[PDB]
Structure formats: C-alpha cells, structure tokens
Design a protein around this ligand. Structure first.
Ligand SMILES: C=C(C)[C@H]1CN[C@H](C(=O)O)[C@H]1CC(=O)O
Ligand SMILES: C=C(C)[C@H]1CN[C@H](C(=O)O)[C@H]1CC(=O)O
Ligand SMILES: [Cl-]
Ligand SMILES: [Cl-]
Ligand SMILES: [Cl-]
Ligand SMILES: [Cl-]
Ligand SMILES: [K+]
Ligand SMILES: [K+]
Ligand SMILES: [K+]
Lengths: 254, 254
C-alpha cells in the first residue's frame, strides 16, 4: 500500500511547482525533498502520497506536553514518513524514529554584509543590534535549554519583552534582517540558500552546534532502518551532493 | 548490567595511559572514546568492560562476504557495543546497527603545506605525487565503489602496482606524507588531529563526502536507540564539542 508522507512548504526543500493550470496530488510539489523521496522510492519500491501537515508546523511541545506538526502526525500514525528539513533533536527522538541524517548543518547567524560583527559573542555582549530566531523551532529551543553562558545571555535577550525579538517564520526573519538592524539565528543550510540569493546578506561566524535533518517515522516503523540504508547508498554514490547542488546554486551574488 | 565493549587503539580515541607501573582492566585506557563511554554510562546507568578487538581490525568484508574486526564481534554477539571511530557505512549498516553519529566528518587529503595541490582533481590528473588510503578502510572502499570519474581515476591509481600506494594504517600513511612525495586520503577528524601536531602538514581541499562515527551494536539491540538519545543530549549540551577540544587541541603552530 501507498505510504502517506507528511511535509511542509519550505524553500528549496518543498515548493509549489509553477504552472499555468491548477495542480493536483504529488505534481503540486518540487524541491530537494521531492527529489529525495523519488530516489528513496527508486531504492525501496514504495508508492507515496505527499500531504502537507495540516497545522503547518514542524513539531514542538507545549505546556501540557502535547506535540503538534509533522511530529504529531507520525505519533498518531496519520503519516508513515515525514520528509522535510526536520531537525533531529533529543526531544523529538524520544517520541519518533528518525533515519540517519541526509544533511548535516548547524545554527549560525544571518546578518548584513560589511559590518564589524564576527560572532555570537559579539552579538551577546551588546543591545543595539537586535537578534532572534523562529519561535518554537529547534534553534529557539537550543537557546532556551543552553547552559553555556553566552547562549544564556542571548536567550535572556530573545525571550525578553514577550519575545519581540522572535519571528513566526524564516521569511519574516529574513525581511527583518533586510530592513532593520537585526540578525537572525538560522540553520546554516538555510543561510547558504538565502545568501546565494540576496547579495546584501552574509553568514556571521561559523556553526555554533552540529546536527542533522532526518526522515521521521513513527516509533517502531520498519521503514526507518530501510530508509537509513537507502540514505547511506545515496550519500556514498554522490547523489545527495548532486541534489544539494541542484537546489542551492544561485547565480547572481558575489 | 555490565556491557562488553569492543574497541581498538587509535589516537586520540583510545590510547594506553602513561603509568610507572603495569595497568589492568579499563584503567589501561584513555581518550575521547573512553570519555564518551563514561558519559554514556552516567546517562544510561550501565557498567562496562572494555576489550580490544582480538584481530585489531575495524570491520571489512572479504570476497565471500565474511566480516572481521569489531563488526564481526558484534555480528557474533561477542560484544554489546563497539565504541571507536567506526565509520557509519552502507555495507556495515546491512549487518550491524549504529547509534546516530557522535561525530561528523568526511574524506579529505592530508599533504604538505605550501604546494600547488588544491583538490582531489589536482591529484587525479597527475602521477608524480603518489596518493592512497589505509587498505580495506572505509575511505578505500569509498574510492573502490565510486562511479564519479575523478574518483574512479584515483581508484585505478591507488589499486595499481599491487596497491603500492595504499598503507596498512594511519601512522604509516602519516610517515609516508612526512618523508616522501605522498598524499594520504584520510578522514577529516584525523587530519585535524594530525595537523595540530605536525605544523608542516595541512588538509588539502574540503570534504569530498559526509559521514559520521556511531556506536555499533548487534542488529536488534535495545541499547542502540538509548545510546542515540544519550548522544543527542551530549551534543545539545555542548559536551561532545568540549570532548573534542580536550583531545584535539595541540601546542600551537608558528
Ligand atoms: C524552517 C524551520 C521553522 C524549521 C527547519 N528546521 C528547524 C526545526 O525542525 O525545528 C526549524 C528552523 C529553526 O528552528 O531554525
Ligand atoms: C583508523 C581507520 C583504519 C578507520 C577509522 N574509520 C575508518 C573505518 O571505520 O573504516 C577507517 C579509516 C579510513 O578508512 O580512512
Ligand atoms: Cl505543467
Ligand atoms: Cl496536501
Ligand atoms: Cl583487552
Ligand atoms: Cl538510527
Ligand atoms: K497557476
Ligand atoms: K526514537
Ligand atoms: K542496521
């Protein structure tokens, strides 16, 4: 039987294709994650229907300890796989089963070019430049949970003033960086995509942590280990590298 | 609840401690993997008995598909865990389980500073500078199996002349780079360790792939998922980073 794949629109992972007529079904979508799913299908031999997660969230826990987003779809067995830039984290791995990573990344800083700011510590030791993250994403959670002094200082700042420094989504964060004196704490692979397309933006510093994106499955799924082996095949043959090059390349920035 | 741990001597992961008297048991060893095992045992609450793998190998298949090394120890249920710089690969994932990675790396090139060589394609297009890898290791297997034209070229060269360009172990490769006109294809984390200590050597180019080290267990082990959760905890608290800095940092280079 056909697997249900939960996902979420996020450039360049999953995007609506451009067409002069209304689109239906899997034909609605293109992107790195659709290519990955096509290759995982080619290897494992399953059919699949792609379904956008109905609440438009990745997966976080609230105050009752209730999950939402793609994580919840898997928990409830309303999806077989989640194929998205879903960060592999301690809290999520307790509740679902991720494949080994198809991409490796870290938190870093998106800001304007031409400034003297060079690191997270440069941000933390000042208050003039505002900085934040996407509310309730894994980057925000990293800062909330950190016991490293610099990151504690940064969390105090972000969470201050009813979290006015946080943004609802990455596009809001990018526009805030482009318009105002603001730096966004963002996953490095998204920074790479953005800076290839807006030439006034740059990554500040290196990666402050290390983590991966993996395919999510419900706990106990037999697909998890089969997908890990397929991912390793695609990596070792250079296919993942080719797919990243295809979707990230921008041709307009120095 | 004492787990049997198979491992292998490899700087700075597992080393003999220095003492004026003979050492016994787990007290024989120190290094990043011993620190990791201490942290995992604190989180998960197990005792452990460390045993060097009797044949002194990581794990590779022969012609008949038979395995050796730490991988074979796990297959035969002679150990509960393998804790070492054991690269997570397609062929090993078919026969053992691994935790998610505690370190992420790629193949790169170890060579001398101040030469014209900038990339693997610089090596592939010539025959004057010899280059190779540790025989039967994951790096050699990467080249053997690659269909990328550059890496096929490189494999043809490495395997020529009864594999004269290959070496038996990393220390042999390091001495050959120091003495002769030779470049070693080596996992990037080992290159970092080496170049901290040999100021006339450098990494050439970037990473030509992406992979991790994981804790190995027999297929079906319940510890694999528990160890993954412990590793993510250690990563997110910044402990893995601190552990790397502790074992890697050298005395500085002029
Ligand atoms: C696009 C966003 C909301 C997602 C992508 N990965 C992270 C996640 O899976 O939580 C989030 C980004 C972040 O928190 O920087
Ligand atoms: C130290 C060596 C022989 C090991 C370490 N990881 C690789 C493995 O697990 O196969 C080998 C290195 C390599 O192949 O470059
Ligand atoms: Cl069309
Ligand atoms: Cl849908
Ligand atoms: Cl021993
Ligand atoms: Cl896993
Ligand atoms: K249209
Ligand atoms: K899990
Ligand atoms: K496996």
């Amino acid at each position: 039987r056909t697997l249900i794949v939960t996902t979420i629109l996020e450039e360049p992972y999953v995007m609506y294709r451009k067409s002069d007529k209304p689109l239906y079904g899997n034909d609605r979508f293109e992107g790195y994650c659709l290519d990955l799913l096509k290759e995982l299908s080619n290897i494992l031999g399953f059919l699949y229907d792609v379904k956008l997660v109905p609440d438009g969230k990745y997966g976080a826990q609230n105050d009752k300890g209730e999950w939402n987003g793609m994580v919840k779809e898997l928990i409830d067995h309303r999806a077989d796989l989640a194929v998205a830039p879903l960060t592999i984290t301690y809290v999520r791995e307790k509740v679902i089963d991720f494949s080994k990573p198809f991409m490796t990344l870290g938190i870093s800083i998106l800001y304007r070019k031409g400034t003297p700011i060079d690191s997270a510590d440069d941000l933390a030791k000042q208050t003039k430049i505002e900085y934040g993250a996407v509310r309730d994403g894994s980057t925000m959670t990293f800062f909330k949970k950190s016991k490293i002094s610099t990151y504690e200082k940064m969390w105090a700042f972000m969470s201050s003033r009813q979290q006015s420094a946080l943004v609802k989504n990455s596009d809001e964060g990018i526009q805030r960086v482009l318009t105002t004196d603001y730096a966004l704490l963002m996953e490095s692979t998204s920074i790479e995509y953005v800076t290839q397309r807006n030439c006034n933006l740059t990554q500040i510093g290196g990666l402050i942590d290390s983590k991966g994106y993996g395919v999510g499955t419900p706990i106990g799924s037999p697909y998890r280990d089969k997908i890990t082996i397929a991912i390793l095949q695609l990596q070792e043959e250079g296919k993942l590298h080719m797919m990243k090059e295809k979707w990230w390349r921008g041709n307009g920035c120095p």
